[PDB]
């Protein structure tokens, strides 16, 4: 089976829950045909993900790499321009490893400021166009509509949400991984 590497933060690693409870594990279970390797770490900024990428590509030799990063950059002092360059590098590295990067749109909280939010959000469509890659919608948009799937911080999806995110992701990824 080919390998799909998930390079994400808390949203893919699972916030305050075990690896087996996070949606990537459920997806892996749902899929013998495709191996889903979760290389996500709670709190990771795009830079921290990029730092771990080289070893991951060499060790896992993935055919596809889902990039779900950037949400932690704002609070970590990174300007939209820095997030853009970091993601650009990640996409470059993924392609150079003969893997297909699958980028996911990320949306920061509204209390971050319109100036930042507009610039930040624009990063994703720009890179997807620049590298001609798939741009998946932010999976949390659907989760936000179900308070019963949100943890207390109003930021991370809870345990009950994972199976649904896994199904949602399976649907989005199906066409991309054949």
UniProtKB/Swiss-Prot annotation:
UniProt superkingdom: Bacteria
UniProt keyword annotations, A-Z: Hydrolase, Periplasm, Protease, Signal
Catalytic activity reported: a fatty acyl-CoA + H2O = a fatty acid + CoA + H(+); hexadecanoyl-CoA + H2O = hexadecanoate + CoA + H(+); (9Z)-hexadecenoyl-CoA + H2O = (9Z)-hexadecenoate + CoA + H(+); octadecanoyl-CoA + H2O = octadecanoate + CoA + H(+)
Binding of substrate, residues: 43, 72
Catalytic residues identified in the record: 10 (nucleophile), 153, 156
Molecular-function GO terms, alphabetical: arylesterase activity; fatty acyl-[ACP] hydrolase activity; fatty acyl-CoA hydrolase activity; lysophospholipase activity; peptidase activity
Enzyme Commission number, as recorded: 3.1.2.2, 3.1.1.2, 3.1.1.5, 3.1.2.14
Subcellular compartments: Periplasm
PROSITE patterns listed in its UniProt record: LIPASE_GDSL_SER (PS01098)
Location (main, coarse): periplasm
A Pfam family recorded for this sequence: Lipase_GDSL_2
Any GO BP annotation: proteolysis
InterPro entries membership: Ester_Hydrolysis_Enzymes (IPR051532), Lipase_GDSL_AS (IPR008265), SGNH_hydro (IPR013830), SGNH_hydro_sf (IPR036514)
CDD domains: Lysophospholipase_L1_like
GO CC terms, sorted: periplasmic space
Subunit and interaction comment: Monomer or homotetramer.
Family to which this protein belongs: Belongs to the 'GDSL' lipolytic enzyme family.
Function: TesA is a multifunctional esterase that can act as a thioesterase, arylesterase, lysophospholipase and protease.
Protein's name according to its UniProt entry: Thioesterase 1/protease 1/lysophospholipase L1
Organism: Escherichia coli O6:H1 (strain CFT073 / ATCC 700928 / UPEC)
